[PDB]
Design a protein around this ligand. Structure first.
Ligand SMILES: Nc1ncnc2c1ncn2[C@@H]1O[C@H](COP(=O)(O)OP(=O)(O)OP(=O)(O)O)[C@@H](O)[C@H]1O
Ligand SMILES: [Mg+2]
Lengths: 53, 495, 62
């Protein structure tokens, strides 16, 4: 419908196609280091506090 | 291009035999037309310049014609053609979403109005038999208005207050809130809002239409703008045009809401018209007629019984009072025509308490009738508690007195609201419930607003089932009360 | 339908317009200056991007 509303329709189809081509880069995780904190504080609290207990 | 040539074709060019008169004297906005022997009173004549006029006086030798435009486009010797129909305006669902002026001429662009039916602006209100008591609720989406001073369908509330105290904002929030009903399945809850702008800056109405379009609220709203620049006989006529566009729905079994904004700037246009007609001024220079002007307009906001379609037309006149003098002439003229009132203090507003409803003076003379039972349960207690708080707030001892002060302050903080943020009925019920039963007496008053926000976020996110239960069964059952109680307690725990 | 002189007159005059429209007829410099100003305000409201450039943002992360 938009293209029907445009005069330079071929440009509209070009843009639509290219848009379909572009996919937003999927951003990534860098913070399994918080899982590292999970494990580290796990051993810390468990061993020291929970066995001194 | 050739579309324009087609536009040429199909244009009515057939000539007709038509009665005519010749203007004698134009000045002060009233033309004196000579001739027009067979012209009816209150007929709509048309000048040679495309203007329109209403045949006001049928004097023996001439006709006084009030011009609906700028009288600079009318000479002496012009030709006036009678159109043979009492002043008419187009009505129908073709107008919804259109900004038509006081006569139905779209000032919107967006092509012309495709109306197929016309009403008379000078109709008569329904009698005594058609009307039936107000039963259904008109949801304003504003906590203070919906809880304390409710409104019904067929009622004609008044909104009265000073300059810039949030009258137009209450009107616009009421218009916007109807969006949810106007999408559901049952046509019995759909409300078709109308908004008459009288003597208002044109830029204001433009921005208002833009806002209503942002909120998707123009699918059902009609804006009838007779702005500040427009001639007085148009500001005088705009309310009647709008009321006719609303009477159409009312008489076809539907429900309408019309907001005249302001009616204090129609009475000024009428005072201009009268004084220029030389009529004898009265109190404040207003003509003695200035009552019948509003009474006849607001008596059409009726509520027809089921034997007459069952439609309805709520009205929300907006009056503006200088220095907050509720006992001036026009404010009392209208306070004795309407079924309620919402006083918007200008000092509560300046304290940041918005909307600034002065719950002490506001009242709704249908009130508890046509109120959702759940809201009744929750808000009767709030009304009593606010009453007690007001009774004692003149000094700031014992446990009960301090308890009243604290609960009242909490409730005041709870009733504040933000612009363009209407709340479903169930959400208001939940908030006022958490406020009145006493699950806030420990939280600092300054935080009561923030709490509210967060609470809504939780309630709308997890427990939509409970709110749907309240909405469907319009009442708080005991199990629903218990679930709401535990929800409030749990949420408040996280503080 | 053709009897009404005015209808046929407008018809023929627009026909002549259409044929003379092999190129747009009677621009006049005023036309060009009006185009200039209105396009200027339009683009200024929109931006300084090209007529038809398909751009990208080149995203980033916190
Ligand atoms: N509920 C509200 N919360 C916060 N601000 C509000 C509220 N209602 C109105 N206001 C503010 O008040 C200002 C003017 O309000 P509004 O125009 O609605 O009053 P008004 O009586 O219509 O003014 P006027 O009648 O002179 O046009 C607006 O800038 C708006 O932000
Ligand atoms: Mg306003």
């Amino acid at each position: 419908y938009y293209k029907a509303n445009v005069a330079k329709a071929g440009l509209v189809d070009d843009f639509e196609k290219k848009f379909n081509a572009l996919k937003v880069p999927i951003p990534e995780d860098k913070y399994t280091a918080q899982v590292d904190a999970e494990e580290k504080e796990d051993v810390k609290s468990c061993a020291e506090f929970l066995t001194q207990s | 291009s050739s579309i324009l040539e087609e536009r040429i074709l199909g244009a009515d060019t057939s000539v007709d035999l038509e009665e005519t008169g010749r203007v004698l004297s134009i000045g002060d906005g009233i033309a004196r037309v000579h001739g027009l022997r067979n012209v009816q009173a209150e007929e709509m004549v048309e000048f040679s310049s495309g203007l329109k006029g209403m045949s006001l006086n049928l004097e023996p030798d001439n006709v006084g014609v009030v011009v609906f435009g700028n009288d600079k486009l009318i000479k002496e010797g012009d030709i006036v053609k009678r159109t043979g129909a009492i002043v008419d305006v187009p009505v129908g669902e073709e107008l919804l979403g259109r900004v038509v002026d006081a006569l139905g001429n779209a000032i919107d662009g967006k092509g012309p109005i495709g109306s197929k039916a016309r009403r008379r602006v000078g109709l008569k209100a329904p009698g005594i038999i058609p009307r039936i008591s107000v039963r259904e609720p008109m949801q304003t989406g504003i906590k203070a208005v919906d809880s304390l001073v409710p409104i019904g369908r067929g009622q004609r509330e008044l909104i009265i207050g000073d300059r810039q105290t949030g009258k137009t904002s209450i009107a616009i929030d009421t218009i916007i809130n109807q969006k949810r009903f106007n999408d559901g399945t049952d046509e019995k809850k759909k409300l078709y809002c109308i908004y008459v702008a009288i003597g208002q800056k044109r830029s204001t109405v433009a921005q208002l239409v833009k806002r209503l379009t942002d909120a998707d609220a123009m699918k059902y709203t009609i804006v009838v703008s007779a702005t500040a620049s427009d001639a007085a006989p148009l500001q005088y006529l705009a309310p009647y045009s709008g009321c006719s566009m609303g009477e159409y729905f009312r008489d076809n079994g539907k429900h309408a809401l019309i907001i005249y904004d302001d009616l204090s700037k129609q009475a000024v246009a009428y005072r201009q018209m009268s004084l220029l007609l030389r009529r004898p001024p009265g109190r404040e220079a207003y003509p003695g007629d200035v009552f019948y002007l509003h009474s006849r307009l607001l008596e059409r906001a009726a509520k027809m019984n089921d034997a007459f379609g069952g439609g309805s037309l709520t009205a929300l006149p907006v009056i503006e009072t200088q220095a907050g003098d509720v006992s001036a002439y026009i404010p009392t003229n209208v306070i004795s025509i309407t079924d309620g009132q919402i006083f918007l203090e200008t000092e509560l507003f300046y304290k940041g308490i918005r909307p600034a409803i002065n719950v002490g003076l506001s009242v709704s003379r249908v009130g508890s009738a046509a109120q959702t039972r759940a809201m009744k349960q929750v808000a009767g207690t709030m009304k009593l508690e606010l009453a007690q708080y007001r009774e004692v707030a003149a000094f700031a001892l014992d446990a009960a007195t301090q308890q009243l002060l604290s609960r009242g302050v909490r409730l005041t903080e709870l009733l504040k609201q933000g612009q363009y943020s209407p709340m479903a009925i169930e959400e208001q019920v939940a908030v006022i419930y958490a406020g009145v039963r006493g699950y806030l007496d420990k939280l600092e008053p300054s935080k009561i607003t923030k709490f509210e926000n967060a609470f809504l976020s939780h309630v709308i996110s997890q427990h939509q089932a409970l709110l749907g239960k309240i909405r469907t069964d319009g009442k708080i059952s005991e199990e629903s009360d218990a679930k709401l109680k535990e929800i409030v307690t749990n949420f408040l725990a996280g503080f | 339908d053709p009897v009404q002189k005015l209808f046929v007159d407008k018809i023929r005059e627009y026909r002549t317009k259409r044929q003379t429209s092999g190129g747009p007829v009677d621009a006049g410099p005023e036309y060009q200056q009006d185009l200039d100003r209105e396009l200027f305000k339009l683009k200024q409201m929109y931006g300084k991007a090209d007529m038809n450039t398909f751009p990208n943002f080149t995203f980033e992360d916190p």
